[PDB]
């Protein structure tokens, strides 16, 4: 049709069936010939299915019978490869100790806070005659003068110094300091009800809790003042010194009168009734534990349910603060997890103390047959080496809204989760111990009992699931694991916060009232850390034990209605308020009229982006000549002097700008949301009219359908961190690259020939000069264009796939075109894709200097004075792929290929596109610090005198040429062994790291403008910075590549050989005096 | 990241550096991987945007660093960013294949200004305030169309 | 087990069955390029499975002692992929596996277990290029295989075609 | 390389299928992930590895020659062997053939200079003090061959090669066997004058202070991977029309 | 189950605990589902919960313990729960 | 054995079809019973039974 356009012209069966049935015939009787059946090709195809439905048949009874949930949540979710240990206490004490040496100077925390002693005591618990180093440095060196916040840290400090000093040699302690805080239930006239925990006021501390929980309540009835909120720099000396007792607020015990914690005991009978000595000592510890605090060193525990914002997390983020050594797991295996429980160690873990991260489902037998030996087990064997000393099973599973009727997998699965597996977990430690004949060490339990047993009503089967848990004690007498295993049930009361009673957060002010306590997370936290003091751990290992850590609501009868109530309360109170607060409203609408109203709906605006170049601050010449010494004026020949001028970059992170963000604020703002977002093509521009109207702003560019910077975010943010960082390799930027169907070759031998085809008579030409006495070329004397058959003995080459491990780099953000960046299409079809990632970091270089006319240079300097220094690693790969691989393959490939596979080529194109620079250019090449080398020369270059200005940086680009090779020399993380590691595309990477595996290869670029010193002040441009060395190094004759040394030491060059009779060359005054 | 560290040891254990000054390991590189021969400038560019921001980053990715490294007490290995009063100085230090290692370092350029006289530095502000906003304009010009 | 053992280090070292001393350790004949020391770990990972946590001085035989308590008579992954690899690379036309192991069986004699000793020890004596015919392909067997036995010590009408022909 | 029997390539397609074979139950299996909807793999059954017909409807590589033009260039002097030199041949057998062409020549150099135990240098001088500024144009070449044409033709290339195929490989080389040198080293890549660029540095290197000797030069190779693209570029004289 | 301890515990025992209790209340929450459909509320069903004190108390009867112990909670719901206009429970306590 | 698989072209009659059943029936197979034995594991065989 194209053609016609450009030029003008437009515009019976039974003979087969027969003809077949022979065919269909030979074929049968030839079998005979060989004996080979036709069917054998199904009856396998048969069996495979027969086998199949009753395979099947089996498969969905279950189904049926057990359920999908339990099935399909009955997973095995373990490895010994899974795990995360977590012990470098040593390091995160000093990145703790800094952040209050400046979240304190910034004024973010005042001496009236109460986490400086949340945050001491996690420092001083970990102490170090290094650690004290690193900060009588920090503050021997402090000018307080600066201001009060300088005097505010070198004044307490010198408190920890010898704090952290005398507890040097020491066990390290759980002391809280939490303010323990009340529910506050409010509704405003709008049906604004709301919750919030506010700060209690009789009792601002746990020694004043521990009273009201030994003051028991009206119902249960048959100082130290200091400067928690005042001044805490004062309370630091107060956490080392001892403050004892002899008035035991045990004491304080009335007659008749029970306390809101109390233990229990048994009688002959069969039941459970409160003591008073025996559950008064659980207290002194208490007490104990609150001036002074509980030490948890050498223990070895495990603990199970500990969700973030949960209970089962207090408790750790005490044990770690302990000393001990501890196990934790999880369903939810994942990278925010990990963080979370990253962050925990980083704050709480201390001296000695131990976590290990696991994926766990306490629903699959196989995987707690699984875990423990992962303990119990050697370190040879991937295992552990540990003992326990105690347990810890809170994990289990929401079911509420279920009766009776509506009990099925979910709670049958659960019921299995917390009782039948807990059994079957602590049925199989002493197996364990049994065998290595452990009887001393045995291992205290913690059952989170509770009191509610059919009192509330559809929670599931949360009764007979710890109900059935009581009789860990008929047994612990009856049978044999008393020595191993002993008992401290737990009843938990009312807590809030946690996602099992936090719907109910709203009526706990209302039930205080009652002469009951509801304990914060933190508080219930108290508890159960005090339930391991070594006092009980006695009483436990004589016998068992329960603890009722309830305020009373055993006593506060028929509590299910009463409970109904007090909310069924608020939600009219609350509901009416709404509707009345909204016809009223509605009233005063018909009377008034929204025209007088409507400008009460106020204007509100959303704000816009305005990005910004991030220029330095340029502060008055004071407070520079001040921080300087004023000796240096006069004193520098700042043509001699460096300086950076401008700099951008490329990755998979965009720009710098952005980049950034992500590197210290590990999140966007819009202002580079939206950038971020204008350089993957999920926006644009349009300024005119789209519906007629004029919309002047960003837009989709995929519906063009106006958007505003506001509605981006939540619009884009997701799927750019899904395309953005380091990922899973995406192939389009790679052209077909599946790293798991590689494409690739193999020469086999053919021996027989057919298949002819009929090609060109210039390639069935190139075939004889190469196959020769070999394929027949044979003209067909019709058409004229000959035909081929190989020949019986020929060579091929055959393709494959060859599924391959590494599959994941920093593939720069996906739906980066330089179109976006103001590029043409014809330099981009001629180019190295690299080359781009290059011009543009150029450009944003510039603009980052003041600069967006190259050509403006050569007003200050002479074109014979701007020069690149800058250059890659492989570079041009994309090209190299062209020449060697693709030529062979009988590809269409350009011509001027090799002058981009080439490495000065793309240092050119910019001087052959912005510059027209002047001749003699350098382009190194040091595959890894090509980007030093390039500053080195850059400088030296400079300094000379060659140029005023220069050019510096690096590039290279990513492709299956590169990688696998990088993939046999064993560098790169594998991929596979980072998922049974559990791990995760975005944290492969891993710096310092004590499982560290190996690196992953980027694409992009970065640069930098330097330039004399002097210029850039006659030539109004932006310092960022300075360069006062560079280097680089090396061992000896290219000799070996894949290992560095020393090298660089020899930055380091000096004879100390006599330093007595200082240098006075240090002495500015000294060279000042000369010049 | 075992011989990156030694050495930052030994240049500080032989140059005087007072026990209990360490230097904090920035590690940009969790978050984009290695562009083989563009580290050096992903790592000159943070020093900058560091420099004069005052911030020092960390990586988010560092579950537990290894025991063998305690003994390098002249240096950490965060995990969670950081603002700070002030830099004044960094280092940038590449170890790549053939042994052609290197290490940049840097300074403040508020160091610089003191060199000189008030008159020249006030007219050099002004010089660039101008700048940044021509520069403004054009970047915005430009990313539009 | 020192059979493959000896071939799977000089496999990776391209050296000769000789040329590389039992006696020695791979930690110097890997001539300090570790880039080849892990290489050769692997391999001999995926060969035999387990070995001494530092193999990086345990000697060549002392290792092959542990091999053979482990190894039993298994050709193993990496070793397959080798003997495929030299049977397809360096191999006459139509001289498959199946082929040369008959062949070995049929010519020379010699059971299942010595067809793999001798395929091993041809993967030591690499052809360098593809043999043409069948004869060239018996020969190098036949090499191979004198070359295994002095390692190990085991030395040792037509008318019904032409109608079959005519009718065609 | 026979520039008169230039081994390429071409993907033609299959139309019926049959000339079956029977490999090695993986590269077997590499053909489905690749090839699917197609080669049948059916093991059979009696020796254990599985056989393949590859379909009426596949692809294929099949090979040309391409009569090329340009075949003459400088040659090196037909038996030339480091061996003869005083070289092993673990390196040879390890090494792009280039880095002999250096190696050579530096002795040589420092033969010229009065000096054969480079380790003298450090008598007078500091191991600080002791430089390379020398680099290549394309560099490697006989290995990036190795990587990008070979490994696509189920080839037994060794492992190191990219640690070769760099250019900062063969002054590497040289410290890593001669000299024993000071870390941050250059490395030029200006194709045809990257042995002024070699000296410009060469100098400034050393005037500044970083060195008090320094090494200089320049080295490539030529391959049919160079040469062919050479000449669509229409750089090289063509040999018939001369 | 007799000779049954913890580190014995097994699906012989899993099984059980799902013979007396979790099918139980399967069952009796399968009777209202009968009963809440047709109206019956006048009629409901007496039950006879075999429990025994035997928690614990004795050795090796595996988990008879928090089985017939997670039953005294047929007692907190039929207060909370509505299924006591159909259901009403005899838990029963056998001795020797 | 030649005559034989050009006769079908004839037909289009494939020779394997009766054994990608069978091989499909299979790894079907393999997963079907992967499942039903970490029951068997996880639960037991008293259970299941």
Avoid at chain 1, 139 to 159: A, F, H, M, R, W
Avoid at chain 1, 233 to 258: D, F, H, Q, W, Y
Avoid at chain 1, 444 to 460: A, E, K, R
Avoid at chain 1, 1033 to 1048: F, Y
Wanted: charged letters at 25%; one cysteine or more; hydrophobic letters at 40%.
């Amino acid at each position: 049709q194209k053609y016609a356009s450009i030029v003008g012209v437009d515009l019976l069966e039974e003979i087969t069936k027969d003809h077949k049935v022979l065919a269909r015939q030979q074929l049968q009787v030839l079998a005979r010939y060989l004996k080979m059946d036709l069917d054998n090709g199904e009856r396998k195809f048969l069996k495979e299915k027969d086998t199949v439905a009753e395979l099947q048949a089996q498969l969905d009874y279950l189904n049926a019978e057990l359920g999908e949930f339990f099935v399909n949540g009955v997973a095995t979710s373990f490895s010994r490869k899974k795990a995360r240990t977590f012990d470098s206490s040593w390091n995160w004490a000093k990145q703790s100790l800094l952040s209050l040496y400046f979240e304190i100077i910034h004024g973010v925390l005042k001496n009236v806070d109460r986490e400086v002693v949340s945050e001491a005591i996690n420092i001083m618990n970990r102490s170090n005659d290094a650690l004290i180093k690193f900060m009588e440095y920090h503050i021997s060196n402090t000018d307080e003068t600066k201001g009060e916040n300088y005097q505010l840290v070198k004044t307490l400090g010198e408190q920890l110094i010898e704090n952290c000093k005398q507890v040097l040699d020491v066990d390290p302690v759980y002391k809280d300091v939490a303010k323990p805080t009340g529910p506050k239930t409010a509704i405003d006239k709008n049906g604004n009800i709301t919750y919030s925990e506010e700060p209690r006021e009789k009792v601002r501390k746990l020694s004043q809790y521990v009273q009201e929980m030994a003051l028991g309540g009206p119902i249960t009835k048959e100082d130290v003042e200091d400067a928690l909120d005042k001044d805490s720099t004062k309370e630091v000396a107060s956490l080392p010194n001892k403050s004892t007792i002899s008035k035991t607020v045990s004491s304080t015990i009335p007659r008749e009168t029970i306390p809101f914690l109390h233990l229990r005991k048994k009688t002959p009978a069969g039941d459970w009734k409160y003591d008073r000595q025996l559950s008064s000592l659980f207290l002194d510890g208490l007490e104990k534990a609150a001036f002074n605090g509980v030490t948890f060193k050498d223990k070895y525990v495990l603990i199970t349910g500990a969700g973030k914002g949960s209970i089962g997390a207090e408790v750790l983020q005490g044990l770690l603060q302990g000393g001990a050594k501890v196990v934790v797991t999880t369903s939810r295996f994942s990278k925010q997890v990990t963080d979370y429980y990253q962050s925990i160690y980083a704050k709480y873990g201390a001296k000695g103390s131990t976590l290990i991260v696991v994926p766990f489902n306490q629903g699959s037998k196989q995987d707690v047959e699984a875990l423990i030996e992962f303990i119990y087990d050697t370190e040879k064997n991937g295992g552990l080496g540990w003992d326990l000393d105690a347990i810890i099973p809170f994990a289990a599973i929401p079911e509420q809204g279920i009766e009776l009727e509506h009990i099925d997998s979910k709670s049958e699965f659960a019921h299995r989760i917390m009782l039948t597996n807990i059994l079957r977990m602590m049925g199989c430690v002493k197996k364990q111990k049994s065998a290595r004949g452990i009887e001393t060490r045995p291992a205290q339990v913690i059952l989170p009992m509770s009191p509610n047993h059919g009192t509330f009503g559809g929670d599931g089967m949360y009764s007979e699931s710890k109900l059935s848990l009581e009789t860990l004690f008929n047994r612990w007498h009856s049978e044999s694991w008393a020595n191993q295993l002993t008992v401290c049930g737990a009843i938990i009361g009312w807590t809030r916060g946690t996602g099992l009673m936090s719907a109910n957060n709203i009526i706990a002010e209302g039930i205080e009232k009652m002469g009951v306590r509801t304990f914060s997370q933190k508080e219930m936290a108290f508890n159960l850390l005090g339930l391991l003091t070594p006092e009980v751990v006695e009483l436990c290992q004589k016998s068992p034990v329960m603890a009722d850590l309830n305020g009373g609501l055993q006593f506060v009868p028929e509590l299910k209605e009463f409970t109904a109530k007090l909310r069924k309360e608020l939600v009219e109170t609350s509901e009416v308020r709404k509707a009345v607060s909204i016809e009223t409203a509605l009233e005063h609408k018909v009377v008034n009229g929204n025209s007088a109203d409507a400008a009460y709906a106020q204007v509100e605006i959303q704000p816009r982006a305005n990005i910004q170049l991030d220029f330095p601050e340029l502060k008055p010449y004071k407070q520079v000549k001040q921080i300087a010494p004023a000796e240096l004026e006069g004193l520098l020949d700042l043509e001699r002097v460096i300086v950076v001028t401008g700099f951008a970059e490329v990755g998979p992170w965009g720009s710098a700008r952005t980049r950034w963000e992500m590197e210290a604020f590990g999140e966007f703002s819009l202002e580079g949301c939206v950038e971020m977002a204008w350089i993957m093509g999920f926006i644009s521009y349009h300024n005119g009219n789209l519906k007629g109207r004029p919309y002047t702003g960003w837009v989709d560019s995929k519906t063009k359908e106006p958007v505003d910077d506001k509605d981006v975010k939540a619009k884009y943010e997701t799927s750019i961190l899904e395309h953005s960082g380091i990922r899973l390799i995406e192939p389009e930027l790679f052209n077909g690259y599946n790293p798991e169907k590689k494409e690739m070759i193999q020469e086999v031998i053919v021996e027989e020939d057919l298949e002819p085809f009929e090609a060109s008579k210039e390639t069935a030409e190139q075939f004889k000069h190469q196959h020769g006495d070999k394929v027949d070329i044979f003209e067909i004397p019709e058409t004229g264009e000959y035909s081929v058959k190989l020949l019986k003995g020929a060579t091929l080459y055959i393709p494959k796939a060859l599924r391959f491990d590494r599959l994941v780099a920093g593939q720069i953000p996906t739906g980066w075109n330089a179109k976006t960046y103001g590029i043409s299409d014809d330099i981009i079809s001629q180019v190295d894709p690299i080359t781009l990632f290059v011009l543009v970091s150029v450009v944003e270089a510039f603009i980052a200097s003041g600069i967006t006319d190259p050509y403006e240079m050569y007003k200050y300097v002479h074109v014979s004075e701007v020069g690149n220094c800058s250059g890659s690693g492989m570079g041009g790969v994309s090209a190299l792929r062209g020449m060697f691989k693709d030529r062979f393959k009988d590809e269409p490939v350009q011509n001027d290929i090799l002058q981009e596979s080439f490495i000065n080529t793309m240092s050119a194109w910019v001087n052959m596109l912005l510059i027209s620079s002047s001749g003699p250019i350098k382009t190194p090449v040091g595959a890894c610090a090509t980007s030093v080398e390039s500053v080195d020369i850059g400088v030296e270059t400079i300094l000379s005198g060659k140029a005023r200005i220069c050019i510096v940086g690096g590039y290279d680009d990513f492709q299956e040429e590169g990688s696998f090779e990088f993939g046999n020399m064993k560098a790169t993380s594998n991929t596979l062994e980072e998922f049974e590691h559990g791990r995760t595309p975005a944290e492969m990477s891993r710096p310092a790291t004590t499982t560290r595996n190996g690196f992953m290869e980027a694409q992009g670029a970065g640069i930098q403008i330097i330039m004399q010193a002097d210029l850039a002040l006659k030539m109004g441009v932006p310092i960022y910075g300075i360069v006062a060395m560079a280097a680089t190094a090396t061992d000896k004759i290219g000799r070996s590549v894949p290992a560095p040394g020393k090298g660089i030491l020899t930055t380091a060059r000096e004879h100390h050989s006599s330093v007595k009779y200082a240098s006075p060359n240090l002495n500015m005054k000294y060279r000042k005096r000369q010049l | 990241d075992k011989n990156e560290s030694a050495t930052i040891n030994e240049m500080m254990k032989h140059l005087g550096r007072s026990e209990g000054n360490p230097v904090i390991g920035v590690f940009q590189k969790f978050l984009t991987g290695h562009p083989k021969g563009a580290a050096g400038a992903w790592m000159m560019n943070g020093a900058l945007q560091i420099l004069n921001s005052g911030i020092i980053p960390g990586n988010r990715n560092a579950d537990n660093v290894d025991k063998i490294l305690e003994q390098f007490e002249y240096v950490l290995y965060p995990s969670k960013t950081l603002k700070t009063d002030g830099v004044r100085a960094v280092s940038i230090t590449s170890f790549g294949f053939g042994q052609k290692g290197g290490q940049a370092i840097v300074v403040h350029p508020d160091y610089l200004y003191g060199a000189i006289t008030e008159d020249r530095y006030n007219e050099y502000v002004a010089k660039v305030s101008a700048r940044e906003k021509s520069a403004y304009k054009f970047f915005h010009n430009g990313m539009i169309y | 087990a020192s059979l493959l053992l000896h071939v799977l280090v000089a496999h990776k070292l391209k050296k000769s069955l000789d040329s590389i001393p039992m006696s020695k350790t791979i930690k110097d004949l890997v001539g300090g390029k570790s880039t080849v020391q892990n290489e050769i770990l692997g391999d001999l990972g995926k060969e035999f499975g387990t070995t001494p946590e530092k193999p990086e001085e345990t000697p060549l035989e002392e290792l092959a002692e542990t091999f053979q308590d482990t190894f039993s008579g298994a050709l193993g992954k990496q070793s397959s992929s080798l003997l495929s690899r030299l049977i397809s690379s360096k191999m006459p036309g139509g001289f498959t596996i199946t082929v040369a192991r008959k062949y070995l069986q049929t010519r020379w004699g010699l059971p299942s277990g010595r067809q793999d000793g001798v395929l091993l020890v041809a993967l030591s004596n690499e052809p360098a290029a593809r043999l043409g015919s069948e004869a060239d392909a018996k020969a190098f067997l036949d090499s191979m295989a004198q070359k295994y036995a002095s390692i190990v010590g085991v030395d040792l009408l037509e008318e019904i075609t032409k109608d079959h022909k005519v009718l065609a």
